[PDB]
UniProtKB/Swiss-Prot annotation, chain B:
Its cofactor is Fe cation. Homodimer. It holds the Pfam family LuxS. It catalyses: S-(5-deoxy-D-ribos-5-yl)-L-homocysteine = (S)-4,5-dihydroxypentane-2,3-dione + L-homocysteine. This is S-ribosylhomocysteine lyase. GO terms for cellular component: cytosol. Belongs to the LuxS family. It comes from the Bacteria. It comes from Deinococcus radiodurans (strain ATCC 13939 / DSM 20539 / JCM 16871 / CCUG 27074 / LMG 4051 / NBRC 15346 / NCIMB 9279 / VKM B-1422 / R1). One of its GO terms (molecular function) is iron ion binding. Fe cation binds at H50, H54, C118. GO terms for biological process: L-methionine salvage from S-adenosylmethionine; quorum sensing. HAMAP family: LuxS. Keywords: Autoinducer synthesis, Iron, Lyase, Metal-binding, Quorum sensing.
Length: 150, 149
């Protein structure tokens, strides 16, 4: 598990970081990015808020970046993982994430996909908190974080 | 897409192909919905799903080749897994069952729990994670069709 090899005490959130790159048999690269909102072990995003962030960024990352495969919350609740079909491009992903965070901070419309039909825990959302976490990231400023291994 | 699955019609627990993307050279990335609980009838506690993530990240990789990622769903009723390869729900179901047996029997320290290796090392619950694995095996897994809204 490559996740456990990053030295979580040495990164500086918020940031974007290439977490890993894998190739398919023919040679296509699948890049995975760590979209980190909070500093590891200094607090966590509430489950309702990260659930709303997942629904919003699922769509907003796709709006600003091609080849997105998935946007998922991390179990540690300090960030999200995003998988993209394409060569590593930390700067491009940082710009996309910034654009998507502006969309997220200003999202005043209903949360996309929230209903008993469309979501598996439809009552567990918190748009006010998700918007504020996006604004906090923008307020602090993103950067491309080097992977510091253990 | 995730919002097009009719969540009131699926039958947890199950394994379901949630999507498949073709890569530029003709290869495929498959996405799987590894559902533990019935949508909207309760959720896995955050600490418990954080432990399930640490355990299944390694156990799924022990039983299935090409795993790219194993992550918890924001709705906390299951996990999403992305795999390089053609769809193979039967193979993923068999791999998930093996991984759940490993999880249910995990009586050693949770892997990766420290300030160095985890972003929230104080939020774990091995006992709850092992019981969730047991409950899925007790109910029994099956391949769930995608019922669209
Ligand atoms: C539940 S919103 C969709 C999130 C999913 N992990 C993906 O980006 O497709
Ligand atoms: C924090 S355990 C590892 C997590 C990551 N989702 C993986 O599948 O690579
Ligand atoms: Zn949801
Ligand atoms: Zn962790």
């Amino acid at each position: 598990v490559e996740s456990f090899d990053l030295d979580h005490t040495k990164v500086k959130a918020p940031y974007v970081r290439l977490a890993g790159v894998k190739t398919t048999p023919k040679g296509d690269q699948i890049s995975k990015y760590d979209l980190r909102f909070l500093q590891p072990n200094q607090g966590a995003i509430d489950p309702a808020a990260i659930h709303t962030l997942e629904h919003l960024l699922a769509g907003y990352m796709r709006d600003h970046l091609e080849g997105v495969v998935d946007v998922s919350p991390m179990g540690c609740r300090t960030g999200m993982y995003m998988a993209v079909i394409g060569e590593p491009d930390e700067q491009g992903v940082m710009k996309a994430f910034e654009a998507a965070l502006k969309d997220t901070a200003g999202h005043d419309q209903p949360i996309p996909g929230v209903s008993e039909l469309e979501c598996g825990n439809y009552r567990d959302h918190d748009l006010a908190a998700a918007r504020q976490h996006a604004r906090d990231v923008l307020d602090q400023g993103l950067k491309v974080q080097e992977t510091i291994l253990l």
